Amino acid sequence: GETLGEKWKRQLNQLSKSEFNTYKRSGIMEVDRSEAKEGLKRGETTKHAVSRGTAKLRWFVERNLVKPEGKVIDLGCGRGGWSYYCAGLKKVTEVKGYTKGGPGHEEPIPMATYGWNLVKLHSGKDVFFIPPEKCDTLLCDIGESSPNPTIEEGRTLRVLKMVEPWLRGNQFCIKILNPYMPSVVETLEQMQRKHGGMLVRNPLSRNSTHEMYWVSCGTGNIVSAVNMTSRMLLNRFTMAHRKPTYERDVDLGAGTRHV
Ligand SMILES: C[S@@+](CC[C@H](N)C(=O)[O-])C[C@H]1O[C@@H](n2cnc3c(N)ncnc32)[C@H](O)[C@@H]1O
Ligand SMILES: OC[C@@]1(O)OC[C@@H](O)[C@@H](O)[C@@H]1O
Ligand SMILES: [Cl-]
């Protein structure tokens, strides 16, 4: 009597490599990253978003699902995609990004995109072990995938326990790696009651992950959101019209900001 999400995961893990590669992009929204990738390889530091993450966060911001403002803390900042984007938003006054260093983990990329001077990224900073800090906006994009959904479940619950102390009177956008397991749904219901917001599927996410984001603005039934996302993902395995929808990548400009 598994959840629809569990049914999706078992089916995903049964795909061949070619099937997986076709499925992951079927009918998704996608930014053309060729130009940014080539530029970044050449050491270019203006205009380019450092990752696909900038476009993901832009989608939420454009729809007023999160409204970054004041002091922004970005947990699991990686290369800095979310941080460099927030740096260009009018209401943002400072951005601090923290990420885990080490082999196999992405390190921050120094960039000169608009508002770069308001951003301080720091590697070698495992957020599970640091004290929470006051901020006006809390972003978190942590959650490592695994073919084992119980491992993802444990990762998601650990992230949720970790972020809660950082939430008080502030905007937020937090990745929920595995939102479909019963303990996670229940945890999310409790945290939504305590801190508000809603759970949303980003159309730029690949079909190979069931990730959803808990955003501070709006409200909605979490069980419905999760189940409708699971149904969509299950239905995409045998999608008749699977062409992705392409959008231009984000241009983050250049120059310092004065607040
Ligand atoms: C998907 S990425 C971030 C993408 C980012 N939002 C962007 O737009 O470029 C998640 C990052 O969180 C980092 N991470 C994982 N566990 C962490 C921890 N305990 N503390 C800090 N960072 C962590 C990973 O190394 C990875 O770089
Ligand atoms: O509502 C916020 C809070 O009180 O929730 C319970 C724990 O997570 C605390 O660390 C956290 O500050
Ligand atoms: Cl609803």
H helices present in 87-221, as ranges: 149-163, 182-195
Residue whose CA lies nearest to ligand 1 atom number 9: 81
Positive or negative torsion for Cα 181, 199, 229, 14: negative
Q: Indicate the SS3 state at residue 142.
A: coil
Q: Which ligand is nearest to the CA of 199?
A: 3
Residue whose CA lies nearest to ligand 2 atom number 3: 165
Annotated binding site for S-adenosyl-L-methionine: 51, 81-82, 99-100, 126-127, 213
Resolution value, angstrom units: 1.9
Report how far residue 36's alpha carbon sits from residue 47's, in angstroms, rounded to the nearest whole number: 8
Domain of residue 200: give its range: 1-259
Q: Which two tokens stand for residue 217?
A: 């603005």
Q: Which two tokens stand for residue 45?
A: 């530091």
- 169 — alpha (psi -120 to 50), left (phi > 0) or beta? left
Q: Which ligand is nearest to the CA of 225?
A: 3
> Could you tell me the CA-to-CA distances from 139 to 60, 118, 206 in Å, in that order?
12, 16, 20
Residue 233 CA to ligand 1 centre (angstroms): 24
Return the number of other C-beta atoms located less than 10 Å from residue 150's C-beta.
Answer: 10
CATH number of the domain bearing residue 246: 3.40.50.150
Domain count, the chain: 1
Check residue 248 and report its DSSP letter: P
> Which ligand 1 atom lies nearest to the CA of residue 102?
25
**Which 3-state string (H, E, C) describes 81-125?**
HHHHHHCCCCCEEEEEEECCCCCCCCCCCCCCCCCHHHEEEECCC
Give phi and psi for 107, each to the nearest 5.
Answer: -100, 150
